[PDB]
Design a protein around this nucleic acid. Structure first.
Lengths: 135, 83, 120, 48, 81, 235, 176
RNA sequence: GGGGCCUUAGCUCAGGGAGAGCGCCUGCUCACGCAGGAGGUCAGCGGUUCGAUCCCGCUAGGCUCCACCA
RNA sequence: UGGUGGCGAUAGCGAAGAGGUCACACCCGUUCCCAUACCGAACACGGAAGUUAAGCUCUUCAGCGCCGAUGGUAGUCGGGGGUUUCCCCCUGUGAGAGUAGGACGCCGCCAA
RNA sequence: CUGGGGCGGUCGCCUCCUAAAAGGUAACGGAGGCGCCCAAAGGUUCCCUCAGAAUGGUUGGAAAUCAUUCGCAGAGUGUAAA
């Protein structure tokens, strides 16, 4: 459950996930990676689920290199409450994702193993994905 | 302030319980009048006290609650002893 | 180790600090000064056009003397430039102590020009 | 404390000016010079 | 039903209508202001003056022109006919 | 060494200069103010009570010679060290300031005229067979009630010599003649010591040439012991 | 005396050793700075002045009281508090202090076994410490209020530590 | 759930550069009194300041008060 | 050469070299003007024995920094469409970044 | 005023974001400040240039005050922010 240690503002606007990514569109730390085909917010619980999933499938395998970090916080008012009276309290932390963006990489491991692990992770994630490799 | 609190903060009596007890016995007095633990006190007060036969007369200069140990005795002055 | 700054560069900073407040025009030009260890030079300028009008120096072959570097020389060159700006009848100027003091040779020169007719 | 003040002339007797000051840093009856528009001059003014 | 509150972030200052007030190539009278600001986003130039509020005004009549102090620094000026 | 440490209050001269502190405390610096570079004219016993006096000289801040009276009262739990003026008898310094809230005879605080404790009605040196009724029994108690310098240790060890005025007079002559033997006694632990040797008990004895070395080999040790035991319990 | 020794013997020896083209390349003693850190004067200002007196006596020059550049809570000092004093000796006074230092005061250092040739700053300047001010005879034990020390910095126009130490060894500076 | 107050020695609790009393240890003194030492995150986090019990904000706990009209 | 101004460091940083009889600095002493929180270092005052080291000028270079295209792309006014937390099509516009490359200076006035 | 009212909270001014590249622009939207201070913390003249680093080192230490090179600015600008 990743966390930014320190932040300026505990409360931010949400934003808009228009367009494609700026960077991180291609694997370069590792060999076999995964990228997105949509745009969405992703949570520390999602990423750690995917991470531990692939690492359990691999059991010693090489290196991973996540390519993101949930910097963004997201609020949520308490339950059964009218509107207004200030912005809701923070709940967790979020990473924002554009399409064309690489999320997880892999090295030290064969292609079939990598593809299967990333499949497993994709099923923990909400969005549509693609298997990718380095050029 | 109250007499029992005052006695404790001035460290004349080591326990507020004892101050209450002796004031309920009425062994003491203020300005020649018999008094009680709830009796009010102030600067310029003249206090008469007993410890068995040991009779003591003292004068009030100040009052406070935080009362660190040596500063407690600045709160008042001994005048006299009798028996 | 040690390191040492060029007092000329310092003088340039002080000169610029001055220059921020003024500039020489027609009918109110700028009178600028230079103070070599062995010479003293003076010029009169329309800073608008970036043009000198008159000039003077110990180096001038007229009135060659021994000091070229004391207050006497400063006075002589001051009166010289004054009559230059008289025959180009401007008679009204502004002074530019170029990061120097209005204390010594500079002061003497300026006083010379004041006496010769130039009005600051 | 920071407190208001009037600053009266001495030839004219007129008040003519106001300001403020610390009583701590400037306790004494302060004085300055200002223009008296009746005496038509710079002139020492005094606090009241 | 529940009960909540205490936003304590509910104010802001009055908007002060900064920016330029006259345009390049525009004729201007004496004393007209040109660019309200705070500090110097822009400096004065010829026949232009700065005030205690860092505001820029024309000392004369003329036409306005904005330029640059060499690099990364701007300027205004009034040039008459 | 001087000590007003209640159970260990004493005076001593030690080959073991233990440790001069890094901090000069208030009392130390006040002594430096008025005694440093001093001159120990005379010592006095305060009339055989457990009290001592140093008559000291020293030049003041203008080179004019001045004097003072340093007093060391070793009473037990309420020992103290005091400094006093010679002629004025005014206290100048004090280690244990003591306010008259204890309704006591004397007082410690500086500026005040110094005063000594109430000396009890005891003949400080047969007279016991005169005054005291030897039928009373447990007279090791009540020799304190007749003499000034007494320990119950000394009283018991002398009473066990069995009418015994002889023991008292002989031991007083011994002390007056400085005829004692500085040893440490150990009665199954509980290590005791005194001028005289042990008189009767089973305890071991180790003798010395100097009472000062006796004191040496015999404020914070007990604190360390408290800490050690508190830790040992937990362990 | 030592300025003439510099101009007449030190400059030839250094020019010959380092193969300098110009005499202006020969390293010069630019200044001597003597400092006392008297951080114990936050409690007593009269301790600052008496250390200031010793410095005046040693250097022959009224010293500049230095003060805290910023507040430092570990040492209990606020910004602007006066906790040192220094003199900057130049020209004749510097050469005379340098002679008094080499020929008189350094021989009176207790158990003097030489000065450290390590104490160059990497640029050619030499710093040393003096533990007791009593090595200077202009100081009397009766006058002394507390055992003061000081530091002495010799700032030189040398480009390296090699050049600076050669300049100092040319005066017979007592390097071990 | 909201608002306020508080969280400091083992307990009770006072208070921009750590205190008291109670209880432990010790001597004095059977049983109290009297003199010392111990035990300290100033609830936690973050911030301001040279410097935080102290000033600021957030969080955890406790307590008190409110939590309503249909 | 020196002085003095103008133009966005295409002027600068950095490395390597060359020169100073004139000139400019560097250099040498405080008796005076004046000065140094301490100071003849600097500022002032006077001087010219020696110094091209350094400063200053003249050459070189593209290591740093600086400037900077074309094309392409994102974005986008406008129009239109669609499975519309977004996406797509069309006329038009059009960056940044990354390149190609440019550049270790251009222009003036005075004095010898 | 009030995403019914009540209770809570707020009520004027300044700074920023939201704010959509002039200006302006709301919400019980997000962050913070003011109800002053300086008789020099003002005016003018003249002067010079910071923060840190390393590195030197008697005290003195992580951390004084000292000296050196690096150092467009990391400091400062009475106070909040721009």
């Amino acid at each position: 459950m990743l966390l930014p240690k320190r932040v300026k503002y505990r409360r931010e606007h949400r934003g808009k996930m228009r367009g494609r990514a700026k960077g991180g569109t291609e694997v370069h730390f590792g060999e076999f990676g995964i990228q997105a085909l949509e745009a969405s917010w992703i949570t520390n619980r999602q990423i750690e689920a995917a991470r531990i999933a692939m690492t359990r499938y691999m059991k010693r395998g090489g290196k991973v290199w996540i390519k993101i970090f949930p910097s963004k916080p997201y609020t949520a008012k308490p339950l059964e409450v009218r509107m207004g009276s200030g912005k809701g309290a923070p709940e967790g932390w979020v990473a924002v994702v554009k399409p064309g963006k690489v999320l997880f990489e892999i090295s030290g491991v064969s292609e079939e193993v990598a593809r299967e692990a990333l499949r497993l992770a994709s099923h923990k994630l909400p969005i549509k994905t693609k298997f990718v490799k380095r050029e | 302030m109250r007499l029992d609190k005052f006695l404790k903060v001035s460290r004349l009596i080591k326990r507020r319980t004892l101050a209450k007890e002796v004031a309920d016995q009425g062994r003491i007095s203020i300005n020649g009048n018999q008094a009680k633990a709830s009796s009010d006190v102030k600067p310029g007060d003249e206090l008469t006290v007993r410890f068995g036969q040991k009779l003591v007369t003292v004068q009030v200069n100040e009052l406070k609650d935080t009362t660190k140990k040596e500063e407690a005795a600045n709160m008042y002055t001994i005048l006299k002893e009798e028996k | 180790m040690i390191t040492k700054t060029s007092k000329n560069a310092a003088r340039l900073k002080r000169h610029a600090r001055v220059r921020a407040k003024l500039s020489g025009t027609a009918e109110r030009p700028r009178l600028n000064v230079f103070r070599s260890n062995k010479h003293i030079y003076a010029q009169i300028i329309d800073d608008v056009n970036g043009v000198t009008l008159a000039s003077a120096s110990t180096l001038d072959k007229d009135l060659n003397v021994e000091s070229t570097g004391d207050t006497s020389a400063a006075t002589k060159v001051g009166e010289l430039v004054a009559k230059r700006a008289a025959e180009k009848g401007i008679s009204d100027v502004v002074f530019d102590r170029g990061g120097y003091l209005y204390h010594g040779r500079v002061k003497a020169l300026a006083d010379a020009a004041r006496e010769a007719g130039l009005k600051f | 404390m920071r407190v208001n003040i009037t600053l009266a002339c001495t030839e004219c007797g007129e008040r003519n000016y106001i300001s403020k000051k610390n009583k701590r840093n400037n306790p004494d009856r302060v004085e300055f010079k200002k223009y008296c528009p009746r005496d038509k001059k710079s002139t020492l003014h005094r606090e009241t | 039903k529940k009960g909540v509150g205490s936003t304590k972030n509910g104010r802001d200052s009055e908007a002060k209508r900064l920016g330029a007030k006259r345009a390049d190539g525009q004729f201007v009278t004496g004393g007209s202001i040109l660019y309200r600001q705070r500090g110097t986003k822009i400096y004065p130039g010829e026949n232009v003056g700065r005030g205690g509020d860092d505001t820029l005004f024309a000392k004369i009549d003329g036409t306005v022109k904005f330029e640059r102090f060499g690099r990364d620094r701007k300027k205004v000026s009034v040039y008459p006919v | 060494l001087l000590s007003a440490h209640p159970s260990y209050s004493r005076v001593h001269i030690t080959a073991q200069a233990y440790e001069n502190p890094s901090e000069p405390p208030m009392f130390c610096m006040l002594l430096r103010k008025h005694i440093e570079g001093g001159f120990i004219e005379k010592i006095e016993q305060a009339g055989l009570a457990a009290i001592m006096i140093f008559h000291i000289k020293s030049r003041n801040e203008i080179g004019d010679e001045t004097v003072r009276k340093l007093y060391v009262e070793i009473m037990g739990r309420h020992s103290n060290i005091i400094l006093t003026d010679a002629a004025e008898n005014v206290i100048i310094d004090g280690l244990k300031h003591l306010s008259p809230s204890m309704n006591s005879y004397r007082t410690v605080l500086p500026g005040q005229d110094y005063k000594l404790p109430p000396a009890q009605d005891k003949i400080s040196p047969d007279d016991i067979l005169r005054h005291l009724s030897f039928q009373e029994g447990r007279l090791d108690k009540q020799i304190v009630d007749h003499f000034s310098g007494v320990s119950p240790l000394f009283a018991k060890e002398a009473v066990h010599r069995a009418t015994l005025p002889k023991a008292l007079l002989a031991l007083f002559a011994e002390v007056k003649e400085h005829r004692f033997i500085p040893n440490i006694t150990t009665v199954n632990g509980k290590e005791y010591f005194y001028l005289l040797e042990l008189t009767h008990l089973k305890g071991e004895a180790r003798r010395f040439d100097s009472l000062s070395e006796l004191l040496d080999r015999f404020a914070e040790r007990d604190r360390v012991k408290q800490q050690a035991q508190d830790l040992e319990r937990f362990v | 005396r030592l300025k003439e020794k510099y101009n007449k013997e030190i400059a030839p020896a250094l020019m010959t050793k380092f193969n300098y083209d110009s005499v202006m390349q020969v390293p010069k003693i630019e200044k001597i700075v003597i400092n006392m850190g008297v951080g114990d004067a936050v409690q007593n200002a009269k301790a600052i002045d008496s250390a200031v007196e010793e410095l005046t006596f040693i250097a022959g020059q009224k010293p500049v009281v230095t003060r805290a550049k910023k507040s430092i809570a570990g040492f209990r000092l606020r910004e602007g508090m006066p906790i040192g004093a220094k003199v900057t000796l130049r020209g004749e006074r510097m050469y005379d202090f340098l002679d008094k230092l080499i020929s008189v005061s350094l021989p009176r250092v207790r158990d003097f076994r030489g000065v450290s040739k390590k104490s160059f700053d990497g640029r050619g300047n030499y710093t040393l410490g003096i533990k007791e001010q009593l090595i200077f005879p202009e100081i009397d034990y009766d006058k002394v209020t507390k055992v003061r020390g000081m530091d002495i910095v010799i700032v030189t126009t040398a480009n390296t530590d090699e050049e600076a130490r050669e300049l100092l060894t040319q005066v017979g500076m007592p390097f071990q």
